Design a binder for this molecule. Sequence first.
Ligand code: ADP
Ligand code: ADN
Length: 345
Amino acid sequence: MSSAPLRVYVQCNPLLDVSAHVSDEFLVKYGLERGTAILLSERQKGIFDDIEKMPNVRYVPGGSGLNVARVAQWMQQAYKGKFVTYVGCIADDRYGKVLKEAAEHEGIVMAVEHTTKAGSGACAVCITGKERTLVADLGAANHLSSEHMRSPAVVRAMDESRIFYFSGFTLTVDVNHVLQACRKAREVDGLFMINLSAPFIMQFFSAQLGEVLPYTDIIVANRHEAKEFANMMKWDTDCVEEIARRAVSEVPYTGTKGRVVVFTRDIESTVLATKDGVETVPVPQLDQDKVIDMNGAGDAFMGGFLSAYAVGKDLRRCCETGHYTAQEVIQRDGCSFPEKPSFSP
Ligand SMILES: Nc1ncnc2c1ncn2[C@@H]1O[C@H](COP(=O)(O)OP(=O)(O)O)[C@@H](O)[C@H]1O
Ligand SMILES: Nc1ncnc2c1ncn2[C@@H]1O[C@H](CO)[C@@H](O)[C@H]1O
């Protein structure tokens, strides 16, 4: 006794994850802070050659938004092809084919661009225990064009979608692509949703972020991203609850659906805020010995949240569905799931 889900539009940078186990000395050798994500810089030249030379290196389709889409689609398997559409840029190369084929196999409509200006993007993922440390080399993802955003497939997708999710990571590419979707979302009275993605977005891309927030109905982030957001806004506060409250009322909002703020906190309760106050949603207890892979927990949470939102569940239940999905993924190496969910939103 379930609904068919509303159509969702997702946009991010499709990246192939190149993964390997690594010491702390290695992190420091390339100037990395453990458990964080950055964009490839000079300081990290050679890191891909170094990782590829290691044993049991894996090549796995990734990308934050793409993981979100896959998790959402996994929660709605009866609706392969009829649910999520994803937009990004790849190249027609080994990596690109892997990415496109995996997503399509799972039922995601890949409205992706193909460029020749660069090879399909990749992310170096450095495993140290349960923690992953990420270095993203966007390549082709960084060349997503206005032509592609004005194309028939994308405009049909936008026109027929009710829920729009962009990762914060898209802000490093071209803010105008994001603003175009913000406007279509308003045109159709849809929902626009964003992820803060990483502290560096607040530090180095606050201007771009600032253009998009007024259109953003739902803002999602984790504990660290929230503190960094407060720092960007110059808010003198040490509380995730207070930061969410201010994100509701003191961050400009030009929408009508109602601004909502969702901050996850790993083991601790998720903070959920609206103009009617601030609520917490407990995270079900889980034996930490079953927790194998912290990476992508946020992406999985997002997927659960969207899959519930698209069948019309209330916010609290959307967070509960997100907890369920995030807790499945962290119990497995990689972005991996049972055949079918055991949870009905
Ligand atoms: N160690 C853990 N034990 C149980 N659940 C976890 C754990 N870490 C994360 N989760 C689940 O994943 C969700 C997202 O986790 P969080 O770490 O806040 O996101 P991110 O991957 O952005 O760091 C949490 O709200 C929680 O439901
Ligand atoms: N800058 C980025 N843009 C898009 N995806 C990213 C970026 N940095 C890391 N990722 C993705 O984040 C995921 C972890 O949640 C990895 O699957 C990785 O591919």
